[PDB]
Amino acid sequence: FVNQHLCGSHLVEALYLVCGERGFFYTPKT
Amino acid sequence: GIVEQCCTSICSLYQLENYCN
């Protein structure tokens, strides 16, 4: 589920699953 | 940032983990 183009909700769901209890930050504009 | 690495181009686990706390 990681090795593809991931955008929007699909990207934040991947972050959620990978990062687990560490949590994550989603910063789409840099 | 994450959009350029994971949305516009193909994501990887290595890159995703850069955004874990």
XYZ file of C-alpha atoms in Angstrom:
51
model
C 0.000 0.000 0.000
C 3.066 2.282 0.255
C 4.693 1.885 -3.170
C 2.333 3.903 -5.290
C 1.082 7.438 -5.833
C -0.682 8.458 -2.600
C -2.658 11.651 -2.499
C -5.050 13.365 -0.104
C -6.931 11.068 2.244
C -5.087 8.097 0.734
C -1.729 9.603 1.807
C -2.863 10.475 5.333
C -4.274 6.927 5.764
C -0.862 5.466 4.730
C 0.870 7.756 7.275
C -1.595 6.655 9.942
C -0.951 2.966 9.317
C 2.861 3.263 8.990
C 3.478 5.647 11.871
C 1.185 3.960 14.388
C 1.477 5.259 17.949
C 4.276 7.666 16.967
C 1.743 9.752 15.067
C 2.729 11.950 12.160
C 2.590 15.376 10.563
C 0.901 16.149 7.275
C 2.189 19.344 5.667
C 1.040 19.473 2.038
C 2.193 23.041 1.381
C 5.913 23.630 1.991
C 7.703 17.904 0.836
C 5.486 14.850 1.119
C 3.224 15.731 -1.804
C 6.163 15.950 -4.249
C 7.669 12.697 -2.951
C 4.557 10.560 -2.428
C 1.684 12.012 -4.514
C 3.343 13.513 -7.647
C 5.981 10.763 -7.603
C 5.841 7.204 -6.250
C 5.870 7.031 -2.460
C 8.109 4.733 -0.417
C 8.205 3.531 3.149
C 11.512 5.312 3.612
C 9.936 8.641 2.664
C 6.711 8.124 4.640
C 8.657 7.439 7.812
C 10.325 10.854 7.442
C 6.879 12.259 8.489
C 6.364 10.079 11.594
C 6.888 11.848 14.943
